[PDB]
Amino acid sequence: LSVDTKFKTEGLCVDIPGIPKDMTYRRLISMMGFYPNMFITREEAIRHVRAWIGFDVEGPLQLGFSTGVNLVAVGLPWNVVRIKIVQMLSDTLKNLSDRVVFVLWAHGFELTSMKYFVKIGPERTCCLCDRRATCFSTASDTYACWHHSIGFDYVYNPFMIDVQQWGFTGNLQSNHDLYCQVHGNAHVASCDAIMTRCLAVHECFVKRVDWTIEYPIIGDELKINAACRKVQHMVVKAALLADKFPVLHDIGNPKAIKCVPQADVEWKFYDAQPCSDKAYKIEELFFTDGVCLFWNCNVDRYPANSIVCRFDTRVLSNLNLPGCDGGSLYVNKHAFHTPAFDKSAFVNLKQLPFFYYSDSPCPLKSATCITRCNLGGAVCRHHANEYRLYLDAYNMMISAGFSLWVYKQFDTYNLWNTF
Numbered sequence: 001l002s003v004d005t006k007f008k009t010e011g012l013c014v015d016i017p018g019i020p021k022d023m024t025y026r027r028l029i030s031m032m033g034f035y036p037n038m039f040i041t042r043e044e045a046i047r048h049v050r051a052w053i054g055f056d057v058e059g060p061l062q063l064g065f066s067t068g069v070n071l072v073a074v075g076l077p078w079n080v081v082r083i084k085i086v087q088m089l090s091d092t093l094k095n096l097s098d099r100v101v102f103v104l105w106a107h108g109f110e111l112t113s114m115k116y117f118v119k120i121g122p123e124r125t126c127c128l129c130d131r132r133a134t135c136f137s138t139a140s141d142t143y144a145c146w147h148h149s150i151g152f153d154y155v156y157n158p159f160m161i162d163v164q165q166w167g168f169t170g171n172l173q174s175n176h177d178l179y180c181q182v183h184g185n186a187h188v189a190s191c192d193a194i195m196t197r198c199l200a201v202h203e204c205f206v207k208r209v210d211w212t213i214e215y216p217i218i219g220d221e222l223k224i225n226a227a228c229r230k231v232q233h234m235v236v237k238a239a240l241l242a243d244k245f246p247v248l249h250d251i252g253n254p255k256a257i258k259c260v261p262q263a264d265v266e267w268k269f270y271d272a273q274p275c276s277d278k279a280y281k282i283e284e285l286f287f288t289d290g291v292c293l294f295w296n297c298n299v300d301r302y303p304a305n306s307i308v309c310r311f312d313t314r315v316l317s318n319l320n321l322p323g324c325d326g327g328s329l330y331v332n333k334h335a336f337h338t339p340a341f342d343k344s345a346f347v348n349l350k351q352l353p354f355f356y357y358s359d360s361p362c363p364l365k366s367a368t369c370i371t372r373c374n375l376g377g378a379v380c381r382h383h384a385n386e387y388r389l390y391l392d393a394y395n396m397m398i399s400a401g402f403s404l405w406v407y408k409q410f411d412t413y414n415l416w417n418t419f
C-alpha cells in the first residue's frame with residue numbers, strides 16, 4: 001500500500017476542522033506525528049485477520065478496543081495507559097498473530113492519539129526470541145514480541161486500516177446494524193471498536209469470501225482436521241452397519257469424497273458451499289429415503305434421517321475469532337465465517353453418543369469399545385490402543401467446537417451383531 005495513495009478525509013473533518021481534502025498517507029502519517037506504511041491494504045488486512053483489534057477513541061479521552069475494554073487517558077495519565085495497552089494486546093494476540101492491525105472508523109482522535117502509545121522504526125526482532133518485535137520498552141531500550149513484552153510500555157510498528165476508506169454511506173452504526181443485531185451501541189468507545197471490527201469482518205468474510213488465502217498454523221489445526229476425518233469415517237460407517245440405509249445423500253462441500261469408500265450404499269452427492277451469512281434453508285436445498293449427511297453443512301432445521309457435524313460458534317479457542325451477527329470466524333488453514341449456533345436446528349435429532357467401533361482383526365474396560373474381543377469378554381491390546389487414540393481425536397474435535405447429532409433411532413446396540 002503506497003504511502004502516496006490518497007486518503008479520504010471527510011470523516012476526520014469534525015475532530016480536525018479544516019483538514020485538507022487532498023491528502024496522502026505520507027502527509028497523514030506525518031500529521032499523526034511520525035515497514036513501508038503504517039496503513040495496509042484490504043488484501044493485507046484479510047491475510048492478517050487474526051491480528052485485528054477494533055480501536056475507537058471518543059472525546060480527556062476514552063480509548064475503546066474490540067476486546068471490550070475502555071481506558072480513560074487524561075482517568076489516568078498516558079504513561080500508565082500505554083502500559084495497559086501493551087499488556088492487553090500481548091495477552092490477546094500472542095497466541096494468534098505476529099502483529100496487530102488496528103481497525104478503525106476514523107474520525108480523528110484515534111489517529112492523533114497513536115503517538116502517545118506507538119513507536120515505529122525498522123523491522124526488529126524480539127530481544128528474547130526470533131519473532132518480529134511488536135513492543136518497545138523505554139526503560140531498557142529493548143524490543144519484544146507479544147510473548148515477552150511483560151513490562152514494556154510502547155506498541156511498535158503496528159498496522160492499521162480505516163474502514164471508512166472503503167466507500168460507505170452514512171455512519172458506523174447504521175452500516176453495522178444492517179447486518180448485525182448482536183452488538184448494540186451503549187455509547188462507549190469499545191462499542192464502536194466492536195462494531196467497526198464486526199463490519200470489517202462482514203465485508204471481508206461474509207459478503208466476500210477468498211478461500212485461496214492460506215493462514216499459518218498456530219495450534220492444533222492439523223490434529224483437529226485429522227480427528228474430524230477419523231470421526232466422520234467412524235460415525236458414518238457405524239450408521240450404515242446399524243441401520244443399513246440403501247442410499248446416503250451427502251450434502252455439502254462440492255469436493256467431498258466418500259468417507260466410507262467400502263460401504264455398500266448408494267452414495268449421492270449434492271454441492272453446497274460453506275454458507276457464510278445465514279444458515280441454508282432446508283426447503284431451498286431440497287431425501288426422505290436412506291440417510292442425509294450434513295458434514296459441516298449448516299442448515300436451519302435438519303431432517304430427521306440425518307447424520308450431522310455442526311460447528312458451535314460459541315467455542316472459546318485461538319482458532320475461532322468473534323464474527324458478525326452472532327457467527328464466528330473459524331480460521332484453520334482457511335477462513336470460514338460460520339453462522340451462529342442455533343440449538344433448534346437439531347430438534348428432529350439427538351446428541352450423538354461417543355462410541356468406538358471396529359471390525360478389524362484383533363487393560364481397557366469400556367462399554368463403548370465395540371469390538372469382537374470386548375464382545376467375547378476382554379479387549380485385546382490393539383483395539384485398546386485404537387480405542388484410546390480414537391477417544392483422543394474425538395475429544396480434540398469436540399473441544400475444538402464441533403458437535404455431532406444423529407437420527408433418534410441410532411443405537412450402538414445394533415453394531416454388536418455385525419460380529
Ligand SMILES: CC(C)c1csc(CNC(=O)c2cc[nH]n2)n1
Pocket residue numbers: 058059060061062072186187188189190191192
Ligand atoms: C470520561 C471520558 C473523558 C469520556 C470521553 S467520551 C466518553 C463517553 N463515550 C461516548 O459517549 C461514545 C461515543 C461514541 N462511542 N462512545 N467518556
Ligand SMILES: [Zn+2]
Pocket residue numbers: 126127128129130131144145146147148
Ligand atoms: Zn519474543
Ligand SMILES: [Zn+2]
Pocket residue numbers: 176180181182183194195198199324325
Ligand atoms: Zn456486530
Ligand SMILES: [Zn+2]
Pocket residue numbers: 361362371372373374379380381382383
Ligand atoms: Zn480386539
